[PDB]
Design an enzyme around this catalytic site. Structure first.
Site, PDB file in Angstrom:
ATOM      1  N   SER A 242       0.774  -1.262   0.000  1.00  0.00           N
ATOM      2  CA  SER A 242       0.000   0.000   0.000  1.00  0.00           C
ATOM      3  C   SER A 242       0.803   1.308   0.000  1.00  0.00           C
ATOM      4  CB  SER A 242      -1.007   0.030   1.141  1.00  0.00           C
ATOM      5  OG  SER A 242      -1.769  -1.164   1.198  1.00  0.00           O
TER       6      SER A 242
HETATM    7  C1  LIG Z   1      -1.452  -2.287   1.895  1.00  0.00           C
HETATM    8  O1  LIG Z   1      -0.290  -2.485   2.289  1.00  0.00           O
HETATM    9  C2  LIG Z   1      -2.614  -3.204   2.133  1.00  0.00           C
HETATM   10  N1  LIG Z   1      -2.066  -4.493   2.443  1.00  0.00           N
HETATM   11  C3  LIG Z   1      -2.502  -5.526   1.702  1.00  0.00           C
HETATM   12  O2  LIG Z   1      -3.467  -5.481   0.958  1.00  0.00           O
HETATM   13  C4  LIG Z   1      -1.612  -6.774   1.840  1.00  0.00           C
HETATM   14  N2  LIG Z   1      -1.795  -7.694   2.743  1.00  0.00           N
HETATM   15  O3  LIG Z   1      -2.816  -7.303   3.659  1.00  0.00           O
HETATM   16  C5  LIG Z   1      -2.961  -8.115   4.852  1.00  0.00           C
HETATM   17  C6  LIG Z   1      -1.813  -8.106   5.833  1.00  0.00           C
HETATM   18  C7  LIG Z   1      -4.201  -7.674   5.637  1.00  0.00           C
HETATM   19  C8  LIG Z   1      -3.269  -9.619   4.470  1.00  0.00           C
HETATM   20  O4  LIG Z   1      -3.459  -9.910   3.254  1.00  0.00           O
HETATM   21  O5  LIG Z   1      -3.299 -10.446   5.394  1.00  0.00           O
HETATM   22  C9  LIG Z   1      -0.482  -6.941   0.930  1.00  0.00           C
HETATM   23  C10 LIG Z   1      -0.167  -6.030  -0.067  1.00  0.00           C
HETATM   24  S1  LIG Z   1       1.251  -6.613  -0.856  1.00  0.00           S
HETATM   25  C11 LIG Z   1       1.339  -8.025   0.132  1.00  0.00           C
HETATM   26  N3  LIG Z   1       2.343  -8.980  -0.032  1.00  0.00           N
HETATM   27  N4  LIG Z   1       0.367  -8.043   0.991  1.00  0.00           N
HETATM   28  C12 LIG Z   1      -3.474  -2.644   3.294  1.00  0.00           C
HETATM   29  C13 LIG Z   1      -4.673  -3.565   3.583  1.00  0.00           C
HETATM   30  N5  LIG Z   1      -5.564  -2.936   4.573  1.00  0.00           N
HETATM   31  C14 LIG Z   1      -5.353  -3.238   5.934  1.00  0.00           C
HETATM   32  O6  LIG Z   1      -4.439  -3.939   6.348  1.00  0.00           O
HETATM   33  N6  LIG Z   1      -6.243  -2.691   6.794  1.00  0.00           N
HETATM   34  C15 LIG Z   1      -5.862  -2.273   8.120  1.00  0.00           C
HETATM   35  C16 LIG Z   1      -7.059  -2.389   9.041  1.00  0.00           C
HETATM   36  C17 LIG Z   1      -7.330  -3.588   9.622  1.00  0.00           C
HETATM   37  C18 LIG Z   1      -8.523  -3.717  10.535  1.00  0.00           C
HETATM   38  O7  LIG Z   1      -8.792  -4.789  11.068  1.00  0.00           O
HETATM   39  C19 LIG Z   1      -9.363  -2.493  10.773  1.00  0.00           C
HETATM   40  O8  LIG Z   1     -10.458  -2.591  11.615  1.00  0.00           O
HETATM   41  C20 LIG Z   1      -8.979  -1.348  10.127  1.00  0.00           C
HETATM   42  N7  LIG Z   1      -7.867  -1.252   9.268  1.00  0.00           N
HETATM   43  O9  LIG Z   1      -7.575   0.007   8.658  1.00  0.00           O
HETATM   44  N8  LIG Z   1      -2.624  -2.495   4.466  1.00  0.00           N
HETATM   45  S2  LIG Z   1      -2.392  -0.982   5.224  1.00  0.00           S
HETATM   46  O10 LIG Z   1      -1.567  -1.188   6.364  1.00  0.00           O
HETATM   47  O11 LIG Z   1      -1.666  -0.190   4.266  1.00  0.00           O
HETATM   48  O12 LIG Z   1      -3.666  -0.455   5.559  1.00  0.00           O
END
Ligand SMILES: *C(=O)[C@@H](NC(=O)/C(=N\OC(C)(C)C(=O)O)c1csc(N)n1)[C@@H](CNC(=O)NCc1cc(=O)c(O)cn1O)NS(=O)(=O)O
Length: 501
Positions: A242
């Site tokens: 991200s």
């Molecule tokens: C960007 O980095 C996004 N990450 C992904 O889409 C990837 N994996 O995501 C996770 C760890 C969740 C998975 O698949 O298990 C990814 C991209 S490239 C790669 N090898 N993996 C966002 C995704 N959004 C997120 O993590 N949301 C955070 C969150 C969790 C929650 O439970 C609540 O209630 C609220 N929020 O915001 N990651 S981010 O860290 O950039 O947001």
């Protein structure tokens, strides 16, 4: 044997303000002419003990080299230990003044400064990269006797030892200490395997701090853990995830097809592309504006924008900002990574490029990309040495597009549902979190400050946090906050969260 080399004084390494980082220290190397040593066998046990060596094992060594005209006894003793041996007045024992490096900041700047080998030659980091600049040239004196080993005369001393040149790094040790301490503490609080933190000057392209965990004491020349010696920030590749979405958004805004107030429908939090499924974590959204896609970090939202504008436009921004590209730093073993490319981009690769799944980048490339964005879209060449005259730099993103993206990233940190843990009390900070599934995770935060006139870009990479919360906004964002707060004050950057002056 033939000829002896007089070691040159290796060039001093300092931080940008002249604080010493690598200093040449006199050491004494002891050598012997076995032929003359044989004339004083009663002296051997005392000599063996003064060198620490075993009596029998040392006597065995000498007898074995009875024909040899020269042999090394011991290298790199402290001048105090070297003099104790000379005090024994053992016939056929000689000394040469050599050099060994001392690193006053030790483990704090180990990976950046580097390490030297047994012959005082650069082995890692700067020591290796600027080896030619730092080494100088060894001394030339003709060791002449007649046919024995006793130096009868000190004849022709022509082109003797030329000292190496001083090098002032871009690193500010004050920011380095802070970055080191904060990354060390976060690794412990999260039970993480490893980490990297890079601080950059967005205006000059200077690397102000570069720290990794695990680290090692480069003054402790034994034990040497190869994993602890890895400059991860420059040698380890990872999926930025991200953290690349601001570059996807830059291409969207530069396309003429998108404005921040535009809306993308992300319901039901999934998108079907052939036999692949794009998926969002929080799937409680329908309409999201462009800032909202970044706050919620919607893979679906960014993928839909990607399909509309085309992957070519996205790849080009990412390529131009230096992601998966040669940094030009010339550190041997430095990793370039990979930015995938196609003549014809299929829908799935278009999406994964847009949300940073398909790629491999280093922490230095990521910080450099964020520096371009922070510096109103102008990329300034990366430098590990102090930049007095700033090179021209390349306008990779238009100033207007970069300024819009900066505002959106400020909202990511400050808006409701944002990355509040990245907030820098007294300043307007901007950035984007990242979480990559390697279940093993990599926690990321990339950003810059102050938002009014960006001065510093920073990347915080935490490899495999082991507590409940592993998300970038939870694990890396507070490190950014802590390091940013201190670095801006150390640089006397005026606080910008002011009442509309
Ligand atoms: C960007 O980095 C996004 N990450 C992904 O889409 C990837 N994996 O995501 C996770 C760890 C969740 C998975 O698949 O298990 C990814 C991209 S490239 C790669 N090898 N993996 C966002 C995704 N959004 C997120 O993590 N949301 C955070 C969150 C969790 C929650 O439970 C609540 O209630 C609220 N929020 O915001 N990651 S981010 O860290 O950039 O947001």
């Amino acid at each position: 044997v033939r000829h002896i080399a007089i070691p040159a004084h290796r060039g001093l390494i300092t931080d940008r303000n002249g604080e010493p980082l690598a200093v040449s220290t006199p050491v004494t190397t002891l050598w012997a002419n076995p032929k003359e040593l044989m004339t004083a066998k009663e002296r051997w046990p005392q000599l063996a003990a003064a060198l620490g060596q075993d009596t029998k094992l040392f006597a065995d060594r000498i007898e074995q080299n009875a024909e040899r005209e020269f042999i090394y006894l011991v290298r790199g003793l402290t001048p105090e230990q070297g003099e104790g041996v000379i005090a024994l007045k053992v016939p056929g024992v000689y000394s040469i003044e050599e050099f060994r490096r001392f690193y006053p900041a030790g483990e704090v700047v180990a990976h950046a400064v580097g390490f030297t080998d047994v012959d005082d030659r650069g082995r890692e980091g700067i020591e290796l990269a600027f080896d030619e600049w730092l080494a100088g040239v060894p001394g030339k004196r003709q060791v002449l006797k007649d046919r024995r080993g006793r130096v009868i005369k000190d004849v022709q001393v022509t082109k003797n030892a030329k000292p190496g040149k001083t090098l002032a790094l871009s690193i500010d040790l004050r920011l380095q200490y802070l970055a080191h301490r904060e990354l060390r503490n976060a690794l412990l609080e999260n039970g993480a395997k490893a980490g990297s933190l890079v601080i950059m000057d967005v205006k000059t392209g200077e690397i102000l701090a570069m720290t990794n965990q695990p680290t090692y004491n480069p003054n402790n020349r034994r034990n040497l853990q190869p994993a602890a010696m890895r400059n991860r920030a420059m040698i380890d590749v990872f999926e930025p995830g991200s953290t690349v979405k601001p570059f996807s958004m830059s291409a969207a805004l530069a396309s003429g097809r998108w404005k921040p107030s535009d809306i993308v429908d992300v319901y039901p939090g999934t998108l079907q592309i052939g036999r692949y499924t794009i998926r969002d974590v929080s799937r409680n959204s329908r309409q999201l504006d462009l800032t909202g896609i970044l706050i919620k970090s919607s893979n679906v939202g960014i993928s839909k924008i990607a399909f509309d504008i085309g992957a070519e436009s996205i790849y080009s921004v990412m390529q131009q900002v230096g992601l998966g590209q040669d940094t030009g730093l010339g550190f041997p073993g430095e990793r370039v990574g990979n930015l995938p490319n196609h003549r014809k981009w299929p829908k799935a690769e278009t999406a994964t490029l847009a949300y940073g799944y398909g790629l491999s980048v280093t922490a230095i490339q990521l910080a450099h990309a964020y520096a371009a964005l922070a510096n109103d879209g102008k990329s300034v060449p990366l430098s590990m040495t102090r930049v007095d005259r700033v090179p021209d730099g390349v306008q990779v993103i238009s100033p207007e597009v970069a300024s819009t993206v900066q505002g959106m990233l400020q909202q990511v940190v400050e808006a409701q549902g944002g990355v509040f843990r990245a907030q820098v009390p007294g300043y307007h900070a901007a950035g984007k979190s990242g979480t990559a599934r390697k279940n093993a995770y990599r926690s990321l935060f990339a950003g810059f400050a102050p938002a009014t006139d960006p001065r510093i870009a920073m990347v915080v990479v935490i490899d495999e946090p082991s507590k409940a919360g592993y998300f970038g906004g939870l694990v890396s964002a507070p490190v950014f906050s802590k390091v940013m707060a201190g670095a801006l004050r150390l640089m006397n950057v005026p606080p910008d969260n002011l009442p509309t002056a």
